[PDB]
Each structure stands twice: as structure tokens, then as C-alpha cells.
Scaffold this active site. Structure first.
Site, mmCIF file in Angstrom:
data_model
loop_
_atom_site.group_PDB
_atom_site.id
_atom_site.type_symbol
_atom_site.label_atom_id
_atom_site.label_comp_id
_atom_site.label_asym_id
_atom_site.label_seq_id
_atom_site.Cartn_x
_atom_site.Cartn_y
_atom_site.Cartn_z
ATOM 1 N N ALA B 73 0.838 -1.182 0.000
ATOM 2 C CA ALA B 73 0.000 0.000 0.000
ATOM 3 C C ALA B 73 0.872 1.231 0.000
ATOM 4 C CB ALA B 73 -0.912 -0.003 1.202
ATOM 5 N N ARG B 74 1.978 1.131 0.716
ATOM 6 C CA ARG B 74 2.918 2.225 0.837
ATOM 7 C C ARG B 74 3.570 2.562 -0.489
ATOM 8 N NH1 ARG B 74 7.605 -0.905 4.376
ATOM 9 N NH2 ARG B 74 8.302 -2.325 2.721
ATOM 10 N N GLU B 75 3.538 1.625 -1.428
ATOM 11 C CA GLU B 75 4.186 1.844 -2.715
ATOM 12 C C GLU B 75 3.218 2.387 -3.756
ATOM 13 O OE1 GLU B 75 6.263 -1.614 -4.029
ATOM 14 O OE2 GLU B 75 8.074 -1.146 -2.892
ATOM 15 N N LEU B 76 1.928 2.196 -3.534
ATOM 16 C CA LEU B 76 0.937 2.829 -4.380
ATOM 17 C C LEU B 76 0.651 4.228 -3.893
ATOM 18 C CD1 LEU B 76 -1.476 -0.135 -4.853
ATOM 19 C CD2 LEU B 76 -0.201 0.960 -6.647
#
Lengths: 162, 129
Positions: B73-76
Site C-alpha cells: 500500500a505504501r508503494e501505491l
């Protein structure tokens, strides 16, 4: 310096989005200004559990009366006769435009004939080129998009017609 | 250096990416895509970091196949951010189903293939040179 142009594009994209929301709201206002049930919804067998269920779940909470079990397209009949029987029962009609919908291979004249009016098409997971292939006229005109608004917002927008 | 780089899923490369790369090459832009097709086990943040080094701008195409790769999620949410040099493109995806993966990415406006044509998106991208 490269980010500045991305910012310019960002602003342009934002203005265009604003114009689009204005357009669909203006057309619905002209549509309401111009039946036992509120809506009927034509869809494919594949879209029923995926999106239609969530949309009718959204609309019935706002107090709208819908029935979707009746209007499932088998791709074995005319689109015209399916939308006129629903206009006899409902105030308005919704067509879910998806990949599953266009795979039924419907006659060009009927899709050209889908386009005040009481029918509202909803684009669900389609590209412009793709809709333009089946019917360039249907793609050229405006309709509701699932890429632009959430299912709940769409439900409120539709409820503005009643 | 190159003008754009476009990361994508392996499934959309023949359907949409080949068309966009064709259209953007017909406009005189030099881009590369075969090197930035992502496998299910990849670091999105580092891949784009490789992309912003050999090119000026970066493109991410957001589709069902892109999301089928369960990215962190942190990468989206990090696609968004801070100065931004990356341009997402929505292709045949629903708003609510993007929210499932990242609400912050869903509220951010981006290029949408349901609004413009591939040739139109190409021109609109070429405006950034």
C-alpha cells in the site's frame, strides 16, 4: 523544471474533469426537468454480481425502487424491445456499458439507437477506442463513468432524477 | 537521455502499451518499455527510480492486471509523492476498485483512457516534450 510541466498537465486535467462533471450534472438537470418503479437496469450475465449488485444496493438505501433480476441480457435478443418494456415499468433506464456488454455482438443500428431521453448509459471499465469501435456515435456522446465517480456518488447523482 | 519510460503489467503490453508506444514514437518521441515490464515480485519504488534516471518522465498504467499484482500500500500511495515527475494512466479500471488498493491514488486525477483516445493521450503527453 520537468515537474512544472507535470503541474501544468495536472491543472489542465483538473479543469477538464471539472467541465465533465458540470456537463453530466447539467444534462441530468435537464433530464429531470423534462411509473410504479424508479429505475430498471440492463446488464450482462457477468456484470450482475460484480457491479450491478453494488449499485442497486447503493440506490435502495437512498430509497429507490429497482429490479435487476428481470433485465439480464442473454445476448439472444434485440436491445430496443428490452429497453421499451422497461420504460413502460420504470421512470428511467440504465444500461451498463462494459466489455461483457459489447461481447454480445449487438446490431449497429440498435447501439446507434441507444441515444429529452429517459435512458442513461453507464461506462464500466471500457476505453474510448473500444467503445468507438462498436459505435462511434455512442462513444462520442456523454454518459456516466465508473472511472470518475464512486458507486455511491453515482447513486446520489441518479437519485437526483427523482 | 530518453523522453518517457512506461511501466506496465505483462498482460497490457500487447493491448494498450504497444499502441501508445507506437503513437508516441510516431510523434517523434523516444521511449522504452520492454525493459520496464514488471513481474509479480518487484519493487515499484526502485523500478521507477531506475526509470527517472534514463528518461525525463515516467508513466504508470493502472489496470486490473496492474493491481492483480498485489503491490504494497505504501508503494501505491507513494506513487503520488513532494515534487512529482510521474504520470499515472487509468485504463479500464473502476474508481471503487482502485480505492480497494489505494484511496489516495483514486482521488488523484490522472489521464483516463475512457475520456481520451490513444492518439489524444499521446499528443497530450507530447505536450510535456
Amino acid at each position: 523544471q520537468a515537474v512544472k510541466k507535470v503541474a501544468q498537465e495536472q491543472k489542465r486535467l483538473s479543469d477538464e474533469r471539472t467541465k465533465h462533471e458540470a456537463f453530466i450534472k447539467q444534462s441530468l438537470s435537464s433530464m429531470r426537468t423534462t411509473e410504479e418503479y424508479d429505475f430498471f437496469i440492463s446488464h450482462a450475465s457477468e456484470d450482475k454480481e460484480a457491479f450491478v449488485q453494488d449499485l442497486v444496493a447503493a440506490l435502495r438505501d437512498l430509497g429507490a425502487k429497482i429490479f435487476y433480476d428481470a433485465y439480464t441480457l442473454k445476448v439472444g435478443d434485440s436491445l430496443r424491445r428490452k429497453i421499451d418494456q422497461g420504460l413502460a415499468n420504470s421512470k428511467f433506464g440504465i444500461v451498463v456499458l462494459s466489455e461483457h456488454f459489447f461481447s454480445k455482438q449487438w446490431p449497429a443500428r440498435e447501439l446507434d439507437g441507444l441515444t429529452q431521453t429517459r435512458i442513461l448509459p453507464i461506462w464500466h471499465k471500457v476505453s474510448y477506442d473500444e467503445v468507438r469501435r462498436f459505435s462511434p456515435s455512442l462513444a462520442d456522446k456523454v454518459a456516466l463513468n465508473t472511472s470518475l465517480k464512486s458507486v455511491e456518488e453515482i447513486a446520489k447523482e441518479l437519485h437526483s432524477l427523482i
